[PDB]
Design a protein around this ligand. Structure first.
Ligand SMILES: O=c1cc(O)n([C@@H]2O[C@H](COP(=O)(O)O)[C@@H](O)[C@H]2O)c(=O)[nH]1
Ligand SMILES: O=c1cc(O)n([C@@H]2O[C@H](COP(=O)(O)O)[C@@H](O)[C@H]2O)c(=O)[nH]1
Lengths: 219, 218
């Protein structure tokens, strides 16, 4: 599994290249893994991955929540890995063929797939939550090794950890701005994803350092 | 939305030169292009403005938006800034995620299309069982534009029943995935067609042929 420094992944969802680069640079001593999603990519282009690699050397998880038919999923994964992403996040709710398409490209290209199981926001309760245990079980059956589950629902995160086993890698968004607790979340997740409570802080480095201090016994 | 010939081109070629050339070859037949991540991630969001400059076609950004509300708002803002007229949003992540997109679309003078059931086999696993409820949710939220599957006309018909005849319904899966254009247009206002056109030996002839096969429906 990837070795995530300080069990902390920055969600870099600022949409301005200069701000995104500044903040990431300021927290680089604390974090060696950055999640780049569509807010930044659709604003600044896929080259932003290259620019982060050039500037920081951080691992890059492309949070693209891939959610199309197998044919299109393959093309998205190819484009994303060609651009230099280490890993891509894929939705499980569109089913096994759609996930398999992503796994096939990742295998061919020597990269990683993360399977998003349950989501952290309130709306996740409407449809995703009821499917999430089965989505995780499907992931295990397909050979998925990396997963995403919600900090906002520790009870659900705990169940998802059980399903995927202790050897699987699990990352978790929702701590901070969405109300999740870093320490509680790290009982189950290998690493926490944190966005706004770092990148909107007056001092993002201090914010990251503070989170790390609060979980220091867990490192 | 008024779609010429009830035919929306899914431009999923990844090379700018090829995408522009093939679109140009079929431009007389369409006035609506669906641009997705295969093209956008290969050539950048500037491709949308380029299509508008060259073709003056309407642009549907097929981004299958499927994040939390905060992120969905950012995605929609970036997408509409690039000149998309509409965006396709998944319903499976729930009402708040859809509402986030509706809010931005209203602010920027654009449309949201709600994807209910998908066309591929894996849609049967989780999406199909939720799809009627996703459609009802769309109705409750005031969604007027929907996407459902050419590959399952009984499901497409049910989706039409739920949303009513006043709603606008577009449908992928005709051609390459096995759907039939004419049958699909019994229920959908327009069909989305990708590979059957853009991978054809002669894309213009492929488009012309499809339109000929549905001429009585135009
Ligand atoms: O269930 C999920 C899955 C996610 O990827 N995310 C992502 O994780 C990040 C959370 O950021 P924040 O710490 O600002 O709430 C965002 O990039 C969001 O898109 C999430 O919030 N919930
Ligand atoms: O359920 C759906 C929803 C889609 O947007 N699509 C999209 O519609 C297009 C179908 O292309 P094609 O005609 O080559 O099968 C692709 O861009 C695909 O991503 C789909 O196939 N099924």
């Amino acid at each position: 599994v990837m070795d995530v420094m300080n069990r902390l992944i920055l969600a870099m969802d600022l949409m301005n290249r200069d701000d995104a680069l500044r903040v990431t640079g300021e927290v680089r001593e604390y974090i060696d893994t950055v999640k780049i999603g569509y807010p930044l990519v659709l604003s600044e282009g896929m080259d932003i991955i290259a620019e982060f690699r050039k500037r920081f050397g951080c691992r890059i998880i492309a949070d693209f929540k891939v959610a199309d038919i197998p044919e299109t999923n393959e093309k998205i994964c190819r484009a994303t890995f060609k651009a230099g992403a280490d890993a891509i996040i894929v939705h499980g709710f569109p089913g096994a063929d759609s996930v398999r398409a992503c796994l096939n490209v990742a295998e061919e290209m020597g990269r990683e797939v993360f399977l998003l199981t349950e989501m952290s926001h309130p709306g996740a309760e409407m449809f995703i939550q009821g499917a999430a245990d089965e989505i995780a079980r499907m992931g295990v059956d397909l050979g998925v090794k990396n997963y995403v589950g919600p900090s906002t629902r520790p009870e659900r995160l705990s169940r998802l950890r059980e399903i995927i086993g202790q050897d699987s890698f699990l990352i978790s968004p929702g701590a901070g701005a969405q109300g999740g607790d870093p320490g509680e979340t790290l009982r189950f997740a290998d690493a926490i994803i944190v966005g706004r409570s770092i990148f909107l802080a007056d001092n993002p480095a201090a914010a990251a350092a503070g989170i790390i201090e609060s979980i220091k016994d867990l490192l």
